[PDB]
């Protein structure tokens, strides 16, 4: 789900 990508980015940047 393309929609989930930015959540993953946010997480791995944290």
């Amino acid at each position, epitope marked *: 789900n*393309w929609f*989930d990508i*930015t*959540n993953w980015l946010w997480y791995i940047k944290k």
Partner: antibody, heavy 127, light 109 residues
Framework: QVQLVQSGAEVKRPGSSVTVSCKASGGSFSTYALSWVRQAPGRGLEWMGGVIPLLTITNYAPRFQGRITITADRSTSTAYLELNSLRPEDTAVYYC????????????????????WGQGTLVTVSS | EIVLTQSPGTQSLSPGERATLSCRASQSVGNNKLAWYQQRPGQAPRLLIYGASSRPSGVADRFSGSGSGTDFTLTISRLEPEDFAVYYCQQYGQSLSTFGQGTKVEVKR
């Protein structure tokens, strides 16, 4: 606060290509999903596609796959919608929309749903 | 493709009355990724509910979302004059996001 400012209304000839711009300020441009949604006169909302600027990853609705291009320019925090081979039924208000965040400022966890909307751009396909 | 059905497409209700708006999905909506938007003529849509039941700050708490799977509901506890408007549901549980065709809540007189 996130603000999305779109380019002005444009009349386009049938068969031509239109580029609509969406300049963002506030929050993060590169790490949040930017989508385009259109609304034909007197009709409902239709999601066209989106881009995640940092990763240069696009996602187009099948109905527009092959007729649209969405790009993002990080130097100007501007996203662009290209729609090609225009027909009268492409006459619509085109909106750019960015996903919201939780919190707590404008740099929090993304929510996917579209919290932030541009003012819309009327594209009129006509001779 | 997930088809979202908003029926009826219009509701005629009295000022102050409770409103319940249905949004049914043709298949289960992943992770309850279901949003509701309000739109008034000449204005951009506005996010009211995301994740089926979460309400952004600033949105009046007379708006509440509920449901899961295929069956979603927007409830307006008491219709204020500004609540007469069009409401869209949207699913974003698949890469192909789709909207319902909207329900116009208008004033019964």
């Amino acid at each position: 606060q996130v603000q999305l400012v779109q380019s002005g209304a444009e009349v386009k000839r049938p068969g031509s290509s239109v580029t609509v711009s969406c300049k963002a300020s506030g929050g993060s441009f590169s790490t949040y999903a930017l989508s385009w949604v259109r609304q034909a006169p007197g009709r409902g909302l239709e999601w066209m596609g989106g881009v995640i600027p940092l990763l240069t990853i696009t996602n187009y609705a099948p109905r527009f796959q092959g007729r649209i291009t969405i790009t993002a320019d990080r130097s100007t925090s501007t996203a662009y919608l290209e729609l090609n081979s225009l027909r009268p039924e492409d006459t619509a208000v085109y909106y750019c929309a960015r996903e919201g965040t939780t919190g707590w400022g404008w740099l929090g966890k993304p929510i996917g749903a579209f919290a932030h909307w541009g003012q819309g751009t009327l594209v009129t396909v006509s001779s | 493709e997930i088809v979202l059905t908003q029926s009826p497409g219009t509701q005629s209700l009295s000022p102050g009355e409770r409103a319940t708006l249905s949004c049914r999905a043709s298949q289960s909506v992943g992770n309850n990724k279901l949003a509701w938007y309000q739109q008034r003529p000449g204005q951009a849509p506005r996010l009211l509910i995301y994740g089926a039941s979460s309400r952004p700050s600033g949105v009046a708490d007379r708006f509440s979302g509920s449901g899961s799977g295929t069956d979603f509901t927007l409830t307006i506890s008491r219709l204020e004059p500004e609540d007469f408007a069009v409401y869209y549901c949207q699913q974003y549980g698949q890469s192909l996001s789709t909207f319902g065709q909207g329900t116009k809540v208008e004033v019964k007189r």
